[PDB]
């Protein structure tokens, strides 16, 4: 029970730090995220046409 609680606390603490780093990277004006979001919309509409 102590080994499972230590593994669950380490996985929950590591997931909280990775979620905070992903939100801070998107607020720093990512130039690669803006170009990839526009190209994904044109490729999805052409496959269903």
């Amino acid at each position: 029970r102590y080994e499972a609680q230590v593994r669950q606390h380490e996985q929950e603490q590591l997931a909280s730090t990775v979620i905070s780093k992903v939100q801070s990277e998107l607020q720093n004006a990512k130039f690669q995220d803006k170009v990839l979001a526009q190209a994904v919309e044109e490729v999805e509409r052409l496959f269903a046409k």
Binding site: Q11, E44, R45, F47, A48
Partner: protein
């Protein structure tokens, strides 16, 4: 094993690739457990929907320009102007052999924390029952473990036995003892004698559902039993659809070649949840503030639990509905509708339950339609006229010293105390046939009234060491001929004098 978190992150990276094809539109208003969706022209009737916050919905009425969607969750997860999502299918749930050992909910999602359920298909909740060509007579025996249920009103595979009664009388206790008594046949290799339980707790509290699942796992009974958790703290659509979702999962075993036992606890809680959603949609309330389709909701779900023929697989489905009466009123609106569709009932009076007679099974009220031919031949031969002698002894004792009345009062008191078992103490067919044969032949009249509990434990232990050939023949063959009847009378007479 070697970074287990890296295996789940790689498989969940690429999944969303095509989910932008109009489909559903948006909503307009929401309230009283409903959601007036504006649009969705391609949505069919009784189809599954999804809100923007993740709440499921069911499009009931679809008029021109609007569509009435019934939310299965809270009203705070749907607002005005939120986009909807059409699933494309109807109200279905998961089924198959992989659901044995997990506690599912109303929509089929696991709530026990054991991960996903390995389902082998997807069956709809609103399924039609079989006709007269794919049905057969009930002939298999359903052992419940109780001595007063296996001899009076016995149950069979494919029949519907109701369990009426008041609160704190023995309604939920009769269904829990029948599921735990099937461990002697499900742990072996006989697939025809096994019966998968299906507990559908609808209307119960949150603490009562967690305590009942822990008691079945400690006695090796939760490995082959489906648990449908449906508390009263959820929406009104989740509790009303708990009866239809539990019947679809148990129907897969009857259509393939296995037996199933469904326990809808309780039937009175399901009628109150269906009336809440109908009263908010501006409907007509009939008797006891119920709609016109109150009798059709319980008759359609109970008609599917029938016994199939040899050309359909040979399986059957047993239904055990518990009716919660209000002060013993068996002539109510919800009480008369369940008794007219089931083949027998088990009345639980609150007067005999407080005196020590557990369970309080009335012989003059509870009966079984297809319970005579769907019983064991060894228990029916030893209990000759057991149902007729139990009802006549209760009426004579309530009005009472003659010579004829003294013989019926002494024999009737010993038979009622010996058939009353404790909680979580089920007996087999071989042990109950030896105890019922001594009380009907006059072998227990010389014993005292307080020694009725001590005589049952002493006779069962002596018959399993000094006469093992007579106990094994009654369970394998299931009947007793001339040689088996003479050996049982000689062993009971020698043990009663010592």
């Amino acid at each position: 094993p070697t970074e287990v978190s890296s295996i789940l992150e790689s498989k969940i990276r690429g999944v969303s690739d095509e989910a932008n094809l109009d489909e559903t539109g948006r909503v307009l208003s929401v309230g009283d457990g409903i959601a007036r969706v504006f649009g969705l022209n391609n949505c069919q009737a009784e189809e599954l929907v999804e809100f923007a916050s993740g709440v499921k919905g069911m499009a009931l009425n679809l008029e021109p320009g609007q569509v009435g969607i019934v939310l299965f969750g809270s009203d705070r997860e749907v607002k005005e102007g939120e986009i909807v999502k059409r699933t494309g299918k109807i109200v279905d749930v998961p089924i198959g052999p992989g659901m044995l050992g997990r506690v599912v909910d109303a929509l089929g999602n696991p709530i026990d924390g054991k991960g996903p359920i390995e389902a082998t298909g997807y069956a709809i909740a609103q399924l039609k029952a079989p006709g007269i060509l794919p049905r057969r007579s009930v002939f298999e025996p359903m052992q419940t473990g109780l001595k007063a249920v296996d001899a009076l009103v016995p149950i069979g595979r494919g029949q519907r036995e109701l369990i009426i009664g008041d609160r704190q009388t023995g309604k939920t206790a009769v269904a829990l003892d029948t599921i735990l008594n099937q461990k002697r046949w499900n742990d072996g290799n006989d697939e025809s004698k096994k019966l998968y339980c299906v507990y559908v707790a609808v209307g119960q509290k949150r603490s009562t559902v967690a305590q009942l699942v822990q008691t079945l796992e400690q006695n090796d009974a939760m490995k082959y039993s489906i648990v449908v958790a449906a508390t009263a703290s959820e929406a009104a659509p989740l509790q009303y659809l708990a009866p239809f979702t539990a019947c679809a999962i148990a129907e897969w075993f009857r259509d393939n070649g296995k037996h199933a036992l469904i326990v809808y606890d309780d039937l009175s809680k399901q009628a109150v949840a269906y009336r809440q959603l109908s009263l908010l949609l501006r409907r007509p309330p009939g008797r006891e503030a119920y709609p016109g389709d109150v009798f059709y909701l319980h008759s359609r779900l109970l008609e599917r639990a029938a016994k199939m023929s040899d050309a359909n697989g040979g399986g059957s489905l047993t239904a055990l509905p518990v009716i919660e009466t209000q002060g013993g009123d068996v002539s109510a609106y919800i009480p008369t509708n369940v008794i007219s569709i089931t083949d027998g009932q088990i009345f639980l009076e609150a007067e005999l339950f407080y005196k020590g007679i557990r369970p309080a099974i009335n012989v003059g009220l509870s009966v079984s339609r297809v319970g005579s031919a769907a019983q064991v031949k060894a228990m029916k031969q030893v209990a000759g006229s057991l149902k007729l002698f139990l009802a006549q002894y209760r009426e004579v004792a309530a009005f009472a010293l003659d010579a004829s009345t003294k013989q019926t009062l002494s024999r009737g008191e010993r038979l009622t105390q010996l058939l009353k078992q404790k909680q979580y103490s089920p007996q087999a067919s071989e042990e109950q046939v030896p105890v019922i044969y001594a009380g009907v032949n006059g072998f227990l009249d010389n014993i005292p009234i307080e020694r009725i509990p001590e005589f049952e434990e002493q006779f069962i232990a002596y018959l399993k060491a000094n006469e093992g050939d007579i106990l094994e023949a009654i369970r394998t063959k299931g009947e007793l001929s001339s040689e088996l009847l003479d050996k049982l009378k000689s062993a009971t007479e020698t043990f009663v004098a010592t």
